[PDB]
Copies of this chain bind each other. A is one copy, B any other.
Amino acid sequence: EYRLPKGILDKEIELIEKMGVQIKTNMRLGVDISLEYLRKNYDAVFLAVGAWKSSTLGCPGDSAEGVIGGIEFLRKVSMNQPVNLGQRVLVVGGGNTAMDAARTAIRLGAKEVTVLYR
């Protein structure tokens, strides 16, 4: 939110909806909606699902409690869901996800946050 406030995003999406676009939220492909349904009742289908599966650490013990994916952590923070942070946080990576997670952890009350890049 400190880089892109969500009110601006809401206003832009409302402008898009004002053009006649019907946005059905909470609808998931493969869970709520099958691809056959869309292919049958729609002339064209455009998939913009995006990369929504954070990579695992790839080292033994990556499934231990207290290790969370970057985008999942940021989604929990944005949704105001309770996350289990702590005094010490290490972020593994060097992309936008790592820096956003580090700064969010700093703003979420972590005493020290350290980013590890290879």
**Which A residues are closer than 8 A to B by beta carbons?**
26-27, 31-34, 36-37, 40-41
Contact = CB atoms under 8 A, between A and B. Distances in A.
Given A26-B40, A27-B37, 12 more contacts: A26-B41, A31-B34, A31-B36, A31-B37, A32-B34, A32-B36, A32-B37, A32-B40, A33-B33, A33-B34, A33-B37, A34-B34
Nearest to A38: B32
Contacts of A36: 31-32
10 contacts: A26-B40, A26-B41, A31-B36, A31-B37, A32-B34, A32-B36, A32-B37, A32-B40, A33-B33, A33-B34
Most chain B beta-carbon neighbours within 10 Å: one of A27, A33, A34, A36:
A34
